[PDB]
Amino acid sequence: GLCIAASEFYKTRHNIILSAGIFFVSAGLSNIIGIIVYISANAGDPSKSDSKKNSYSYGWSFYFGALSFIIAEMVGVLAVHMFIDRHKQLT
Amino acid sequence: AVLKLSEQGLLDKLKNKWWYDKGECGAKDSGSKEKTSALSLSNVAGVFY
Amino acid sequence: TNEFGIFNSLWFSLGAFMQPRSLSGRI
Amino acid sequence: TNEFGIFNSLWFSLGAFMQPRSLSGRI
Fold this sequence. Notes:
The structure is cut from a larger assembly and holds 4 copies of chain A. Chain A is built from 2 helices and no strands. With about 90 residues, the first copy, chain A, is mostly helical. The first copy, chain A, is rod-shaped, with a radius of gyration of 19 Å. The interface of C and D includes residues 7, 13 and 17 of C. Chain A: Belongs to the PMP-22/EMP/MP20 family. CACNG subfamily. Chain A: This is Voltage-dependent calcium channel gamma-2 subunit.
């Protein structure tokens, strides 16, 4: 993405931005899954009727991962749009 | 005496007294008193993947 | 090109806010 | 101009009776 924002580069015109954009999205997607997967598991932990309030505290880190992952995704999206615009300009 | 006690249902009575009556777990009562609800992301998660 | 991505992101967000045959985005 | 508001109010009432990318009315 850094090489694709003008340079000094790339020398992969646009194409690079599209690739970079997907990678950020995938990165975000992976992050969303990992956080969720980890999260899903703890909530189920039946223990067992008078908890969950109660029970534990949870995330925590999750929250951050919940925010960080989201942020990452957003960034990826932005990158993708940038590449798209670049592509448009070339055409 | 044993035969007399059984016919008077006294034996069956004694068993009920120490097995079920002297119990802390009404089986049909524990199922009649098991209220709840809540949700479970579990099932919904499978549709996310 | 940057605004073209904003107008589209708002269009896909409208295609998101729920309700041709480009097989890719079709499925 | 007054009738133009009536024809539209009847069109939005048809968009009401339930079933482009103007982000405003889109959301």
